[PDB]
């Protein structure tokens, strides 16, 4: 995972191991090495500086200059800083008796497949999901979700071309009633770039449907551009959480590493493979360990 960084961070720590106690200037050099590794993983300057400051403080508070094994102290403190940067404690959207969640994002984020994989996850946890294919302009996008729903065994409502939000809301509520659906997953329109008309429609769909989560699906491999997509969707529509797809293809992790700081939104799920069960709850502590080479490989 995040191969270059992980290698980079492990290299920085390992360059310390077996060489006894270090000085404050030595601690300085390692810290600069970490900061550069993060920046090369596309982390912005402020986020990287904050990370390194966190590590400095916490390492001092653990006697890194007294330790005959300071590499281990740096390992532990880089692991805590990674854990917090990645979100801290693991987070999932809250479940009430009934839920209505939007999935938003660009064409290419894997949003539509993600909607189906989410429905499957929640069905397995005992939910009764309904997928809603809400693109009112592109029948093919709706048909794609129809056939994904058939694969994962989850029902799909398809909107009509040009259907009003009020008509959508009514057809959704009725189907949800009749089928005892308790988790409605609305796959909104995906485009290659955002423009004013869809955003307007979506912000409008949000007013009418009143979702209680708005999950933004981002291709993790887009690094900083994912964060720019996130602020556009958050200011124009309003987001509640993130899903990062193709986390297996991302050698760097910079969007992931920066999301809490920059967006203030949690990463709920990771797409880590093309398997149906490739969409997994996101586990910052687990991922921090992995980046540092601990645990399973
Ligand atoms: Ca309005
Ligand atoms: Na997709």
- Domain of 124: which CATH number? 3.40.50.300
Of 90, 111, 136, the one marking the end of a domain is 90
Q: How far is CA 242 from CA 32, 63, 168, 216, in A?
A: 30, 37, 25, 5
Q: Which ligand is nearest to the CA of 205?
A: 1
Residues 117, 201 share a domain: yes
**Backbone conformation region of residue 47, classed left if phi is above 0, alpha if psi is from -120 to 50, else beta:** alpha
Residue carrying structure tokens 């090369």: 40
Q: What span, in angstroms and rounded, lies between the C-alpha atoms of 227 and 252?
A: 14
Task: Calculate how far, in angstroms, residue 114's C-alpha sits from the geometric centre of ligand 2.
Answer: 7
Please indicate, yes or no, if residue 294 is contained in any of the structural domains: no
Residues 276, 134 share a domain: yes
Residues 222, 95 share a domain: yes
Ion ligand 2 residues within 5 Å by Cβ: 110, 112-113
Contacts of 256 (CB under 8 A, 6+ apart): 2, 86, 220, 244, 247, 250, 267, 287
**Binding site, annotated residues:** 105-112, 187-191, 245-248
Q: What span, in angstroms and rounded, lies between the C-alpha atoms of 177 and 161?
A: 23
Please indicate, yes or no, if residue 291 is contained in any of the structural domains: no
Residues 173, 274 share a domain: yes
| Nearest in space to 241 (alpha carbons), one of 219, 220, 212 | 212
Residues 182, 53 share a domain: no
Please indicate, yes or no, if residue 289 is contained in any of the structural domains: no
Please indicate, yes or no, if residue 171 is contained in any of the structural domains: yes
Residue 72 CB neighbours (<10 A): 15
Resolution in A: 1.1
| Strands 267-271 and 279-281, sheet pairing | antiparallel
3-state secondary structure of 260: helix
Domains: count for the chain: 2
Residues 82, 122 share a domain: no
Task: Calculate how far, in angstroms, residue 59's C-alpha sits from the geometric centre of ligand 2.
Answer: 43
Residues 173, 48 share a domain: no
Residues 51, 107 share a domain: no
Instruction: Please list, residue by residue across 271-282, b when 16 or more beta carbons sit within 10 angstroms of its beta carbon and e when fewer do.
Output: bbeeeeebbbeb
Residues 104, 86 share a domain: no
Residues 140, 75 share a domain: no
Task: Calculate how far, in angstroms, residue 115's C-alpha sits from the geometric centre of ligand 2.
Answer: 8
Sheet of strand 213-219, all strands in order from the earlier edge strand to the far edge = 156-158, 129-133, 183-187, 99-104, 213-219, 241-245, 267-271, 279-281
3-state secondary structure of 296: coil
Of 59, 90, 121, the one marking the end of a domain is 90
Task: Calculate how far, in angstroms, residue 144's C-alpha sits from the geometric centre of ligand 2.
Answer: 8
Contacts of 187 (CB under 8 A, 6+ apart): 103, 111, 112, 115, 131, 132, 133, 134, 135, 141, 145
Domain that holds residue 52: 2-90
- Residue 49 · residue 259 · CB < 8 Å: no
Of 38, 60, 90, the one marking the end of a domain is 90
Please indicate, yes or no, if residue 295 is contained in any of the structural domains: no
- Domain of 73: which CATH number? 1.20.120.140
Residue carrying structure tokens 């969640």: 101
- Residue 13 · residue 75 · CB < 8 Å: yes
**DSSP one-letter string for 72-109:** HHHHHHHHHHHHHHTTSS-------SSEEEEEE--TTT
Q: What span, in angstroms and rounded, lies between the C-alpha atoms of 266 and 154?
A: 26
Q: Which ligand is nearest to the CA of 148?
A: 2
Residues 213, 142 share a domain: yes
| Nearest in space to 13 (alpha carbons), one of 29, 4, 23 | 29
**Binding site, annotated residues for GTP:** 105-112, 187-191, 245-248
Residue 144 CB neighbours (<10 A): 18
Contacts of 209 (CB under 8 A, 6+ apart): 100, 102, 165, 168, 169, 172, 186
Residue 21 CB-half CA count within 13 A: 8
Task: Calculate how far, in angstroms, residue 277's C-alpha sits from the geometric centre of ligand 2.
Answer: 15
Residues 125, 245 share a domain: yes
Q: How far is CA 39 from CA 34, 59, 71, 273, in A?
A: 9, 21, 21, 26
Please indicate, yes or no, if residue 167 is contained in any of the structural domains: yes
| Nearest in space to 56 (alpha carbons), one of 22, 81, 83 | 81
- Residue 193 · residue 168 · CB < 8 Å: no
Please indicate, yes or no, if residue 122 is contained in any of the structural domains: yes
Task: Calculate how far, in angstroms, residue 240's C-alpha sits from the geometric centre of ligand 2.
Answer: 20
Task: Calculate how far, in angstroms, residue 207's C-alpha sits from the geometric centre of ligand 1.
Answer: 7
Please indicate, yes or no, if residue 288 is contained in any of the structural domains: no
CA angle 103, 84, 49 (to 5 degrees): 110
Distance of CA 120 to the CA centre of its chain: 18
């Amino acid at each position: 995972m995040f191969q270059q960084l992980s290698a980079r961070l492990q290299e920085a720590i390992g360059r310390l191991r077996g060489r006894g106690r270090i000085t404050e200037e030595d601690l300085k050099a390692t810290l600069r090495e970490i900061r550069r590794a993060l920046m090369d993983a596309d982390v912005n300057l402020e986020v990287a500086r904050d990370f390194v400051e966190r590590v400095r403080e916490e390492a001092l508070g653990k006697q890194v200059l007294e330790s005959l094994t300071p590499a281990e102290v740096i390992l532990a403190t880089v692991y805590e800083a990674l854990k917090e940067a990645l979100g801290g404690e693991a987070r999932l959207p809250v479940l009430k008796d009934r839920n209505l969640w939007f999935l938003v994002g660009l064409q290419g984020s894997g949003k539509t497949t993600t909607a189906a994989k989410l429905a499957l996850y929640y069905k397995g946890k005992g939910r009764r999901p309904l997928l809603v294919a809400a693109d009112t302009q592109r029948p093919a996008a709706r048909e794609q979700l129809r056939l994904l729903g058939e694969k994962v065994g989850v029902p799909v409502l398809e909107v009509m071309d040009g259907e009003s939000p009020e008509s959508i809301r009514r057809r959704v509520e009725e189907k949800a009633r009749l089928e005892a659906r308790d988790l409605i997953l609305v796959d909104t329109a995906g485009r290659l770039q955002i423009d004013e008309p869809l955003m307007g429609e979506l912000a409008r769909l949000k007013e009418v449907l009143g979702p209680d989560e708005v999950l933004l699906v981002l291709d993790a491999m887009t690094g900083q551009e994912a964060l720019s997509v996130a602020r556009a969707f958050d200011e124009k529509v309003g987001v509640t959480g993130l899903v990062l797809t193709k986390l297996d293809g991302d050698a760097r992790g910079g969007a992931a590493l920066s999301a809490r700081h920059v967006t203030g939104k949690p990463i709920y799920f990771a797409g880590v493979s093309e398997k149906p069960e490739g969409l997994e709850p996101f586990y910052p502590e687990r991922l921090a360990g992995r980046i540092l080479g601990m645990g399973d490989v």
